[PDB]
RNA sequence: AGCUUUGCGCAGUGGCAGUAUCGUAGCCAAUGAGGUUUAUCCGAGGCGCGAUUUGCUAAUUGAAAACUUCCCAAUAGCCGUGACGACUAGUCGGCAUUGGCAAUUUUUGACAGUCUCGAGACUGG
């Protein structure tokens, strides 16, 4: 009824916000090309 | 032979450099420039105009500051699972990837500070 048999979660995914990772990245600008391309009008992707 | 003087040239230490350093082709000047001192004396440039190479390096703006770039795709531990295989439903080896790996036996920290002569003691109020 304690809700027995002492557990030890190694290994085993825990339940809940322990879990929480975060990263900030910013990556560099991908511009794109105007001036003396050699190719046709419309922008490169 | 040594010392030494004067002028010039070279290099070096240092100092100075817009009341400084010069050019002058224009004029004047020791056949006298310029002189308030000392003038029956002194003695050198004066007035104007006109200027004040080269190499190296830094920094800034600028898209670019002058010596022959960006982007995409893919390659470069263990527990389960799927097959393949091997050995008797079980076990083992390698391969593969479609969940997880901070809660006492390990990989997410009983560590840190102190003191004494390779060895121990104290504290974490």
Redesign the pocket.
Known sequence: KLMAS?????????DGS??AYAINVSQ?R?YRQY?NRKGGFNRPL
């Open positions: 002492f557990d030890s979660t190694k290994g085993k995914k825990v322990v879990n560099k991908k001036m």
